Amino acid sequence: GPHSMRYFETAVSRPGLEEPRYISVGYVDNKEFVRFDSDAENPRYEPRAPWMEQEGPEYWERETQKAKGQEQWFRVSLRNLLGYYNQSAGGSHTLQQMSGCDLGSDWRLLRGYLQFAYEGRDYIALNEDLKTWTAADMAAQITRRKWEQSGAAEHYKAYLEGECVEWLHRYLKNGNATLLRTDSPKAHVTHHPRSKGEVTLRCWALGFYPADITLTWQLNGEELTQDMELVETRPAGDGTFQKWASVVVPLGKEQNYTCRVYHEGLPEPLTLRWEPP
């Protein structure tokens, strides 16, 4: 399967106080692995995955020191941004960054990744080429023109193809057991009676990991594209996920309808129907 590493950095300008709240969150295969939060009593990078504990208090120190340097980069970039958008504020402003790399199944680098957002809107992003930039608006053009002169793209390229990849290999090697793991969904259909001789058939999919799942309802062997009601894949809280899909079907004609659950953790795709005792 493919692998990814991402650092989800957030800087929230606090009005009054003259330093933001920096929050760097590390993910390896979409699973939180490390985390940094400036709002902590003793701010430092912490393991958020067990396999991350194999790392020496030496490694944490190198990262924590990087966070301190970012905590500043944001503060300045925040200030400068507030200028470009004429926002002089005793109001909070939020700058977010997503950096990292995607790998194939062979662990060979596929894509370098670097995006920035101001106020929840895309600001600037380095293109797939890891050479050119794309600015969202006129204010973002200042940063583009600033970074084209700086040659800043080259350092990010160097990190994303170099450090990012080399590192991700270590993490994948170290977390293999935890990472290769899949929790299969445990499904079931629930019968929810209603008016006009109709029933809601809820196909539940529970305790599965990864969050990627497909739920389909079938009448005699034809998908119910627009009839169907989903829910956004929600975390159980125990590390697994939940999702459900429902269809309004006429009474008695229940077993005419079939639910199919497609997940990578399944030994084969689950085919279900309302089983009344």
Partner: protein, 100 residues
């Protein structure tokens, strides 16, 4: 000034069973700015000692938090989750419905 409306989901960790201790989750998502207020309530009275996830955001830049409290579902006891956010005119209250 990009105020994104929070999407709430109130649900149990494990399938509900009256009298069986469970965990009630309140999944807030699709919001921005990150500052939010999440209350969880039993019969309308705010539940004390509510555990909350750490600050995470999604590929689309929206933030997400997972509030959850220990709860023992009953036929009578009503649970809900109340959210105050900059993007909303008034607090959205989403009630737990054991069927979803």
């Amino acid at each position: 000034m990009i105020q994104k409306t929070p999407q709430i989901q109130v649900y149990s960790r494990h399938p509900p069973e009256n009298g069986k201790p469970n965990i009630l989750n309140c999944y807030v998502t699709q919001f921005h700015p990150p500052h939010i207020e999440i209350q969880m309530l039993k019969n309308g009275k705010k539940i004390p000692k509510v555990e909350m996830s750490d600050m995470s955001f999604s590929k689309d830049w929206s933030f997400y938090i997972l509030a959850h409290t220990e709860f023992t579902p009953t036929e009578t006891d009503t649970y809900a989750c109340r959210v105050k956010h900059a993007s909303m005119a008034e607090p959205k209250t989403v009630y737990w419905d054991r069927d979803m």
